[PDB]
């Protein structure tokens, strides 16, 4: 069912994560970690202290889809292992040393065609698929977007609710 999912999303904050390639999203799903640029790392750390749940919604550039969503379980921390991110052009490894731990809520895909009816007030009411890495998604839009994803029956939200 969706009841525990709705509970997790209650009063959550949502942020759009735009990855340049699938490999980093695959690594994030396997290891439960994410890293972003310093400007967004600061935003996520502020949000983590401010909200009962902080939700990252992932989209690989040019894929035309979202690849799932996850809840921050910690602030960023350095010096814990060297994550073998595939680094885009202009992207060095020192701009990813901040590692957040995340718990996946859904690892299923959602095509952009299914979210065309949702606009984000914090990005000029453009379709929620549109936005830069780190763009915040307003509560109602973010909640409805997460509820569009196919259910991920491999995930038990009981442990996530306890992290809260
Ligand atoms: C592990 N995390 C990430 N993995 C990937 Cl492949 N792209 C990301 C990630 N975070 C943000 N972006 C988009 C971006 C923004 C700025 C530059 C600077 O050249 C490169 C890429």
UniProtKB/Swiss-Prot annotation:
Listed result of changing residue 133 to K: Does not affect ability to influence alternative splice site selection
Its localization reads: Nucleus; Nucleus speckle
Substituting residue 18 to L results in:
Does not affect ability to influence alternative splice site selection
Tell me what effect the entry lists for residue 132 to F: Reduced binding affinity for N6-methyladenosine (m6A)-containing RNAs by 9-fold
UniProt binding sites for RNA: 18-20, 34-35, 85, 133
Q: What does this protein do?
A: Regulator of alternative splicing that specifically recognizes and binds N6-methyladenosine (m6A)-containing RNAs. M6A is a modification present at internal sites of mRNAs and some non-coding RNAs and plays a role in the efficiency of mRNA splicing, processing and stability. Acts as a key regulator of exon-inclusion or exon-skipping during alternative splicing via interaction with mRNA splicing factors SRSF3 and SRSF10.
Name the UniProt record assigns to this protein: YTH domain-containing protein 1
Species per Swiss-Prot/TrEMBL record: Homo sapiens (Human)
The gene from which this protein is expressed is: YTHDC1
Q: Which residues of the full protein are shown?
A: 345 to 507 of 727
């Amino acid at each position: 069912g969706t009841s525990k999912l709705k509970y997790v999303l209650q009063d959550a904050r949502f942020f759009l994560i735009k990855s340049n390639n699938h490999e980093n999203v695959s690594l994030a799903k396997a290891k439960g970690v994410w890293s972003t640029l310093p400007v967004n790392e600061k935003k996520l750390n502020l949000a983590f202290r401010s909200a009962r749940s902080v939700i990252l919604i992932f989209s690989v550039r040019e894929s035309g889809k979202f690849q799932g969503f996850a809840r921050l379980s910690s602030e960023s921390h350095h010096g814990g292992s060297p994550i073998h991110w595939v680094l885009p052009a202009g992207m060095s490894a020192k701009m990813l040393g901040g590692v957040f731990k995340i718990d996946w809520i859904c690892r299923r895909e959602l095509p952009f065609t299914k979210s065309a009816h949702l606009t984000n007030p914090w990005n000029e009411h453009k379709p929620v698929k549109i936005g830069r890495d780190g763009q915040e998604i307003e509560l109602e839009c973010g909640t409805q977007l997460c509820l569009l994803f196919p259910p991920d029956e491999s995930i038990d939200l009981y442990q996530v609710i306890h992290k809260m």
